[PDB]
Structures are given as C-alpha cells and as structure tokens.
Amino acid sequence: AQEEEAEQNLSELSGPWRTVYIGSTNPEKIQENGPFRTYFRELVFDDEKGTVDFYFSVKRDGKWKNVHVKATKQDDGTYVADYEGQNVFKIVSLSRTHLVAHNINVDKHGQTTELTELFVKLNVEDEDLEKFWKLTEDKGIDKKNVVNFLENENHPHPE
Amino acid sequence: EEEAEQNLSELSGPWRTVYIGSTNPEKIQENGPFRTYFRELVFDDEKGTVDFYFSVKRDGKWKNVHVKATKQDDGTYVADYEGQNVFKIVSLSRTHLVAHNINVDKHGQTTELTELFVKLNVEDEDLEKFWKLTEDKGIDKKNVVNFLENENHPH
Numbered sequence: 015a016q017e018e019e020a021e022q023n024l025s026e027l028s029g030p031w032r033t034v035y036i037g038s039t040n041p042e043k044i045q046e047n048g049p050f051r052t053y054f055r056e057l058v059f060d061d062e063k064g065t066v067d068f069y070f071s072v073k074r075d076g077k078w079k080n081v082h083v084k085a086t087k088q089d090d091g092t093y094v095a096d097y098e099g100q101n102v103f104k105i106v107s108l109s110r111t112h113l114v115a116h117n118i119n120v121d122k123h124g125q126t127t128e129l130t131e132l133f134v135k136l137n138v139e140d141e142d143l144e145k146f147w148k149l150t151e152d153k154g155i156d157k158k159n160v161v162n163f164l165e166n167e168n169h170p171h172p173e
Numbered sequence: 174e175e176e177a178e179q180n181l182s183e184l185s186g187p188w189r190t191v192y193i194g195s196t197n198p199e200k201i202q203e204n205g206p207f208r209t210y211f212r213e214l215v216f217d218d219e220k221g222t223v224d225f226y227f228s229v230k231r232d233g234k235w236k237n238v239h240v241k242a243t244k245q246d247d248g249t250y251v252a253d254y255e256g257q258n259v260f261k262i263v264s265l266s267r268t269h270l271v272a273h274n275i276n277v278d279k280h281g282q283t284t285e286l287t288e289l290f291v292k293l294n295v296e297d298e299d300l301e302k303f304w305k306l307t308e309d310k311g312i313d314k315k316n317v318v319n320f321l322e323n324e325n326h327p328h
C-alpha cells in the first residue's frame with residue numbers, strides 16, 4: 015500500500031488572495047512583461063470537483079490582462095493546468111492565511127521552469143463586517159452609497 | 174508556538190481598503206477624493222501620529238498621496254486632506270480597522286464617511302518556508318520578485 019487518501023477541505027480558503035513573492039529558475043519568466051509576473055486577486059477551491067480557479071492580473075505588451083485559470087487535482091495530489099504551456103503545481107504549505115507553492119512549467123519550446131511562490135489571504139471577519147455595517151447605519155449612510163474596493167475593476171496599477 | 178509582542182507600531186505595514194461609505198456619494202464616486210485605495214499605514218506611539226499612504230484617481234489618473242494625522246487628547250485624530258478632517262478609530266486589531274471620518278471641505282460642506290480596512294499579514298515562519306523551498310529548488314535570491322512592495326508603491 016502506498017500513501018492513504020487525504021481528507022481535503024479547502025473550500026474554506028476561497029477568497030481574495032495576494033502575491034507576496036515569486037521566484038523562478040528562469041528570470042525572464044517573471045521579469046517585466048513575463049508570463050508569470052502574476053498579481054493574484056482571487057482563489058476559489060472546490061472540494062467536490064477537486065479544482066482550483068485562479069484569478070490574477072498580468073501585464074502583456076504594455077497592456078493589463080485579467081486571467082482565469084482552472085486547475086484540476088490528480089491522484090498524485092498535485093494540480094495540472096494550462097497557462098503559457100503545461101503546468102504541474104504543488105501546495106507545499108497551506109493555512110488560513112498563507113500558501114506556499116511550487117510550480118513546474120514547460121513552455122511551447124519544451125523549456126522547463128520551476129517557480130516558487132508565497133501568497134497571503136485577505137481575511138475579512140464577520141465580527142468586523144458587522145461593526146462596519148452598524149456604524150454605517152448609525153451615520154445614516156445608504157447601502158447603495160458604499161463602495162466595495164476588494165472586487166472592483168477600477169484599481170491602481172502596481173507597474 | 175509563539176506570537177510577536179503586541180505593539181501599536183506592530184500594526185504598521187500594508188493595509189487594504191475593503192469598504193468605504195459616504196453621506197455624500199459624490200465624494201466616493203469615480204474621481205471622488207475619498208475613493209481611496211490604501212497601501213500602508215504607519216503608527217507612531219511616541220509622536221501620536223498615523224501616516225496614511227494611499228492612491229486615488231484624479232482627472233483620469235492615479236495619484237499616490239501621503240497624509241499625516243495627529244492625535245488629540247480625546248483620542249481622535251486630525252488631518253489636512255481636501256479640507257479639514259477629524260478621524261475616529263471605532264475598532265482596531267492586528268487585522269482590521271473600522272473608522273469614522275468627518276470632512277468639511279473648502280466650501281463648508283460636511284461629509285461623514287465610514288470605512289473598513291484590513292491588514293496584510295506576512296508571518297515569519299511562512300517567509301522561512303518560502304525561502305527554504307526557494308533554495309531547495311536552486312533559485313537565486315536575485316531571481317525573486319517582491320510583488321507586495323510593488324503594490325505598496327504603485328504609479
């Protein structure tokens with residue numbers, strides 16, 4: 015018998031995530047205009063379908079692009095996805111606030127690049143949201159006069 | 174199992190805007206002066222100040238702004254930005270900030286705003302795990318990009 019099945023419940027970790035660091039065996043991939051110079055926005059984990067949806071932004075040819083990638087889990091425990099080639103992604107460390115991952119990418123020219131990354135989650139607690147809504151109500155502010163800055167197209171550019 | 178000692182200055186660092194509400198919608202609409210995307214906050218217990226770093230779009234473009242608020246005896250803070258402001262912290266912890274701001278502009282018009290901000294926390298052990306994995310893969314330190322500081326200092 016090899017290893018045994020892993021009880022996986024990551025649905026909980028879905029939400030807004032941000033890129034902290036990304037390292038690469040090939041600097042070109044993460045330098046300005048590189049395909050893996052990715053600013054994460056959101057991650058959605060589905061435990062039933064065994065997938066992870068990645069939502070991030072990348073600058074290409076002087077233009078900003080919003081990308082959506084779907085990764086599928088394997089018996090291996092790793093995830094596979096198509097993006098600037100084929101990718102095999104492993105979650106090395108994971109908690110309610112951080113994710114440390116390792117990714118192997120093989121581009122259309124058979125070139126292999128290994129990347130490491132650290133992402134952090136932007137956690138918004140129910141207790142704090144309640145405090146905000148009560149205060150907002152106390153000041154007579156209408157719900158329609160509240161702006162969501164976490165999920166909004168019009169935002170600053172990191173570069 | 175250990176946690177850093179609690180210090181007001183320990184709250185300093187990258188912060189992000191979640192929600193901002195206004196009694197006057199125009200102040201937070203596109204090109205409004207209070208449609209502020211936070212970058213960093215620096216708290217100074219000694220001086221009784223809070224330095225705000227944020228970005229706001231004006232005339233079609235993003236501007237990086239810095240504002241220094243000074244604490245009063247009653248615990249509230251005062252700051253100069255698009256008129257006079259009196260800022261009150263309603264709730265504050267290692268991960269969140271809920272505040273109420275009263276603004277009176279150059280025309281004597283009063284606007285009250287509410288906001289919810291969250292801190293981006295990067296733990297020591299998580300950074301160590303990242304660097305260990307990075308060295309395990311033979312990746313040179315110069316081949317690592319800090320995305321967080323890029324977002325904290327946009328253009």
Ligand SMILES: C=C[C@H](C)CCCC(C)(C)O
Nearest residue numbers: 083097101117129130131
């Ligand atoms: C360490 C992660 C790299 C930087 C991004 C890979 C994202 C994916 C899943 C689309 O291949």
Ligand SMILES: C=C[C@@H](O)CCCCC
Nearest residue numbers: 225252258274286287288
């Ligand atoms: C006066 C300083 C500003 O950063 C206050 C922003 C208040 C948002 C509710």
